[PDB]
Amino acid sequence: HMQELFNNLMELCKDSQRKFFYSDDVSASGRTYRIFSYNYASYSDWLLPDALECRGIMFEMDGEKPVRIASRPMEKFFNLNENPFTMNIDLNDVDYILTKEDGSLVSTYLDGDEILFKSKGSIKSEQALMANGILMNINHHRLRDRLKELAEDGFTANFEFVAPTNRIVLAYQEMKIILLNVRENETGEYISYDDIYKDATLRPYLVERYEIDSPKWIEEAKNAENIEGYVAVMKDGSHFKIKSDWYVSLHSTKSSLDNPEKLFKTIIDGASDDLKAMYADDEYSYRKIEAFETTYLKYLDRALFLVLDCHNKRKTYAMEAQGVAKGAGMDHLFGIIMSLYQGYEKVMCEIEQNFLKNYKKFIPEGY
Ligand SMILES: Nc1ncnc2c1ncn2[C@@H]1O[C@H](COP(=O)(O)OP(=O)(O)OP(=O)(O)O)[C@@H](O)[C@H]1O
Ligand SMILES: [Mg+2]
Numbered sequence: 309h310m311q312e313l314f315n316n317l318m319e320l321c322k323d324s325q326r327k328f329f330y331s332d333d334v335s336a337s338g339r340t341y342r343i344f345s346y347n348y349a350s351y352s353d354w355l356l357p358d359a360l361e362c363r364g365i366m367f368e369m370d371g372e373k374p375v376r377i378a379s380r381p382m383e384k385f386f387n388l389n390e391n392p393f394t395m396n397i398d399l400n401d402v403d404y405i406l407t408k409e410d411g412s413l414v415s416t417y418l419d420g421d422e423i424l425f426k427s428k429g430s431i432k433s434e435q436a437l438m439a440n441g442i443l444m445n446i447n448h449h450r451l452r453d454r455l456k457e458l459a460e461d462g463f464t465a466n467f468e469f470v471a472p473t474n475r476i477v478l479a480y481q482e483m484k485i486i487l488l489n490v491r492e493n494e495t496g497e498y499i500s501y502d503d504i505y506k507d508a509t510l511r512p513y514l515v516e517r518y519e520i521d522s523p524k525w526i527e528e529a530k531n532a533e534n535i536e537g538y539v540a541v542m543k544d545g546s547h548f549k550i551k552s553d554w555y556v557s558l559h560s561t562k563s564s565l566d567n568p569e570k571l572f573k574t575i576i577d578g579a580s581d582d583l584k585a586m587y588a589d590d591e592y593s594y595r596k597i598e599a600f601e602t603t604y605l606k607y608l609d610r611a612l613f614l615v616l617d618c619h620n621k622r623k624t625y626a627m628e629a630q631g632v633a634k635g636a637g638m639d640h641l642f643g644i645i646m647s648l649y650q651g652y653e654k655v656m657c658e659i660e661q662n663f664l665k666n667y668k669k670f671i672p673e674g675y
């Protein structure tokens with residue numbers, strides 16, 4: 309049930325502050341919501357219970373009690389061959405593949421009598437309030453009424469918000485929302501693509517689908533231009549993504565595998581999952597990216613512990629924050645501990661830049 313699921317997620321947000329976290333917002337109606345998301349996480353983190361559902365799922369709260377799963381976006385999923393989840397796939401068990409739109413996730417939720425969108429991490433993000441604007445206009449009144457009845461039966465409708473102002477790599481003419489999928493809020497079951505298609509009000513918005521008969525579609529997609537790629541939907545309802553080399557080479561920093569300050573840049577932007585799957589045919593470059601990956605996560609772990617723990621507990625702290633920084637070799641994390649005296653997020657921004665400058669120290673041994 310839901311209470312079980314809410315607990316498993318709360319557990320994750322205690323393990324470390326850059327693995328899993330949450331955040332509470334309040335809505336216009338005055339209701340209280342809690343969003344479970346994530347910042348960084350390695351394959352083992354994703355083995356923790358229900359860790360794969362800690363990407364924007366949102367609970368309406370009552371104090372510290374979940375009352376309902378107000379919004380259910382997709383589970384975390386990975387690129388093919390990115391890690392042990394997505395290696396040894398029977399490509400013959402791909403049901404079909406879906407165009408991958410380049411934009412931002414927005415997911416429905418009911419707030420009293422109002423059907424609204426939340427971005428991945430917030431119900432007040434720019435994308436959230438614009439998506440809201442879009443849904444309340446007269447052109448989307450048929451769809452708004454259908455998503456409102458879906459919410460009321462407790463489903464979550466998931467859209468990719470695209471726009472020329474919100475351009476990531478691909479270039480979209482108009483601002484619009486594209487219906488990706490629909491999820492039952494409690495069980496997380498997906499509505500079948502064919503049911504969404506039968507609704508002629510939803511059919512206009514629904515992401516294009518392609519049938520496949522040979523795994524040759526992956527080579528074609530890897531070698532295509534001006535597309536991000538595809539989301540493959542398995543016969544069991546799980547999903548794996550295939551991005552084009554073209555997209556990945558444009559979404560990473562330039563010369564990533566050559567300049568180690570570039571590779572680390574790729575990692576601090578969360579783009580090294582696409583890169584790793586791009587070099588999955590190259591055992592050396594594949595396992596090298598994992599090295600630099602672990603390095604930066606090992607660091608973050610240590611760093612974030614020391615910075616926040618110290619600042620949990622006056623010139624006392626000043627001299628005491630020096631014992632943590634110098635005691636761990638990184639005197640860079642001293643002005644960082646000055647933050648909790650000044651103001652808090654804004655922090656994680658600073659730990660990154662400070663890593664790239666001393667970066668030469670952390671470069672894995674043998675690389
Ligand atoms: N047809 C589609 N089906 C599913 N997801 C899609 C589709 N088109 C675009 N997406 C987007 O793909 C995202 C997941 O793949 P992507 O590599 O873009 O993730 P990300 O934004 O880097 O974050 P993460 O690594 O945490 O998944 C989803 O957030 C979703 O908004
Ligand atoms: Mg995307």
Ligand SMILES: [Mg+2]
Nearest residue numbers: 578579581582
């Ligand atoms: Mg990624």
